[model samples]
Target chain A: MLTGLNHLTLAVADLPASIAFYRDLLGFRLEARWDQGAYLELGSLWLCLSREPQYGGPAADYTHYAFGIAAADFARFAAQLRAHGVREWKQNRSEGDSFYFLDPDGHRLEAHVGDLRSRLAACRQAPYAGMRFA
Target chain B: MLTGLNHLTLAVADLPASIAFYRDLLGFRLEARWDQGAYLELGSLWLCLSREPQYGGPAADYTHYAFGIAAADFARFAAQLRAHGVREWKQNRSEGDSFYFLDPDGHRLEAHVGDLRSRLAACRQAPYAGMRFA
Candidate 1:
């Protein structure tokens, strides 16, 4: 039987640039590397970024997806990302703390800690209320 | 350095039914289960399904997402899903093998093991060309 989703494949305009943004800027651990792309491990999840444009479809509307982190570790994670030159959207929201950044391909992503509902609600109510991660 | 995305969060309509479709039917292992929801491990990633709608947003558009599996595993997985009462659509597509289904809350989802490019291409070409999970 088919199992669960293992990883999400994202196409980047520039492979190396995307890698630098995700790796150097973000803190995703490199799990596997291939000629066409690379695999990053975030906790138990895998993010696969491919250099070949053909591997990914046209870019969709820019939207942010959130990843969970411990509330206590929020500061450490934010600092690490900042040191790597990643961008932040804002400080804490009504729901929790969060920051936003883009991948090399310009895909929006966020790392956050706190209640998911409140975080999402806050984003909806005030899209740019948080700090921007550069 | 950070690498890639490993999994996604989905709030299902039904817990037992979702489990039956994903585990009993789809064949994913029960990775972990908490009071709120269960974690199904697939490949290198995890699907964290929470019973608490609080963890999820109001049901969004019933859009579908694709997954890559060994082409060889396609039949086994499809057959298992069918046996468990999953649904199907048309045959293979210009891109590759695919099928669709809905969770309890009616969130549209899909699973397929094939070339990422072609599979996504086909999904866009004919969203319903794929099958469905129960």
Candidate 2:
């Protein structure tokens, strides 16, 4: 039984670039660091970024992580991510707007305000027309 | 940066088995599901499980995730995982003790009471001996 997320440790490709994307672009506070890894805090979330080679396989899909945002802040958050040149992973429309992007290591990450139930309900009207171009 | 984790969507091989693991065994509230995927809630964290193939390459490392647990409830949680046949992945002791295990899909997950700062301090005193067997 999980109480709350303590932290997520992702295998990153370039250590410096990953840190910059999260710290400079994402605005996470640096909590700690070692030689080739670092820990960051955004709100109450702790993220661990480790530089390691990815074991290649199929392309990563939307099975990623989406961070929560206030409904009012959604547009602002989307604009900021675009200004940073974060690649769009998909464009699935729903009541809950979301911004999806990839890190230097190609891990699909997202930001959204709502849960799946609400979004799926929205998809009921729109019928989730399938993945749109990034 | 991230405010809160909206969800962690993981790919699964068997949809039925995945649902049972998270819903019946792990106690996550099932929020939604489709032909090959599902969403779950544990506390405020939302989890998405997709039945897809894992991209194979290098063996997955400890670059995983850890959930927060109360210090008082740590032992009980550890026992639960062991009783469930969840395999131990590592035992890097620090001031904070953690239980690391692999999900049915081989995703590494952890439940930890302490954090990196405290754990590192413990590692300094004892000099982390490295990975222990399962």
Chain A TM-score, each candidate: 0.64, 0.78
What would the per-residue lDDT of candidate 2 be over residues B1-134, giving only the tens digit for each residue?
35767778877777777788778756778876666577677887778777675433225654686887888887887898789898878885636768888777667888888765665566456643331110
Tens digits of lDDT, candidate 2, A42-66: 8777788776755332255445877
Off by over 4 Å in 2: A53-59, A120-134, B53-59, B115-134
Each candidate: chain B TM-score = 0.64, 0.76
Top of the candidates by DockQ: 2
lDDT of each: 0.54, 0.71
User: What is the DockQ for all candidates, taken in turn?
Assistant: 0.11, 0.37
RMSD of each: 12.0, 5.9
lDDT of 1 by residue, A1-134 (tens): 45445345566656677767666656666654545666565664556666655333333332234566666776787787677666554355435666666555445566656443443355455644232211
Q: Please state the error at residue B85 of candidate 1 in Å.
A: 2.7
lDDT tens digits, residue span B4-113, model 1: 34335566545666766666655666754444555566664456565644333333321234565667877776676677665443355435566665445554456666
For model 1, the local distance difference test gives 0.54
